[PDB]
Amino acid sequence: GPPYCVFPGRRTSSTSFTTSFSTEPLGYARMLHRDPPYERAGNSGLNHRIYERSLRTVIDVAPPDGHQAIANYEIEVRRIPVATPNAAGDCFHTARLSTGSRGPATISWDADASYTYYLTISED
């Protein structure tokens, strides 16, 4: 069915990670890479990366250091139309990192500069 987002209906916890990002106008040059750096996803115990590939926007979420996930995690992206301060936003894509998986959990979409994107990662 349509993507279902539990956040922001529910509140996030101390080990959740949230961030937002913009996509640049597609006429602005990027230097693309087959394997861009992972960064720690705040206090979640996971790593993440947000990048583009030939354009597609991609989010990967994985345990550190070749480990398996020790729990189940919900990964959600909402998109909010730009220049619309009263916009409600849409639940856009979701993914799961399941207990025992190695990852990454991945989400991708056709790159679009007309929305701001909001990522949440949380343990179930």
Residue numbers in the entry: 36 to 89, 94 to 163
What does the literature reporting this entry say, word for word?
Fusarium oxysporum f. sp. lycopersici (Fol), the causal agent of tomato wilt disease, produces effector protein Avr2. Avr2 is required for Fol virulence in susceptible tomato varieties, but triggers resistance in plants carrying I‐2 (Houterman et al., 2009). The Avr2 protein is recognized by I‐2 inside the plant nucleus (Ma et al., 2013) and exerts its virulence function inside host cells (Di et al., 2016). Consistent with the potential for Avr2 to target a conserved defense mechanism in different hosts, we demonstrate that Avr2 suppresses PRR (FLS2)‐mediated responses, such as growth inhibition, ROS production, MAPK activation and callose deposition following flagellin22 (flg22) treatment.
